[PDB]
Amino acid sequence: LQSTFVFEEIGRRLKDIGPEVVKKVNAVFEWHITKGGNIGAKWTIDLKSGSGKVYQGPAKGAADTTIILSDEDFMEVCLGKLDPQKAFFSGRLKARGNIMLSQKLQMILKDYAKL
């Protein structure tokens, strides 16, 4: 899966910026990465306490938001070739629970990525 390198890089960056992100975000994001429409990987980005954490599999507690999309579509979002809001409205990106939290996540992580 192409997305594995991205989740690992998010975990490495959270070592440095995690405390500041956690204050601004305050939530737990679960990711179901599909291939052949079948779940090829699950990840959690826990931005709720400490320096935050990225780990494999479902949230240890409740996830605020769950996003489901293909490995390819996830990579296209990360490469700026697919707008995440456009993918959502076209039905390529599924988001459950608190949908707008994940758009907050998008904005904050884009800000830090520019530093």
From Swiss-Prot:
Record-annotated SCP2 domain positions: 3-115
UniProt binding sites for substrate: Q85, Q103
Positions where N6-succinyllysine occurs in the chain: K42, K104
Chain span(s) of sequence motif Microbody targeting signal: 113-115
The organism's place on the tree of life at top rank: Eukaryota
N6-acetyllysine modified-residue sites: K48, K86
Listed name of the protein: Enoyl-CoA hydratase 2
Organism: Homo sapiens
Lineage of the species this protein comes from: Eukaryota, Metazoa, Chordata, Craniata, Vertebrata
Designated gene of the protein: HSD17B4
Section of the entire sequence shown: 622 to 736 of 736
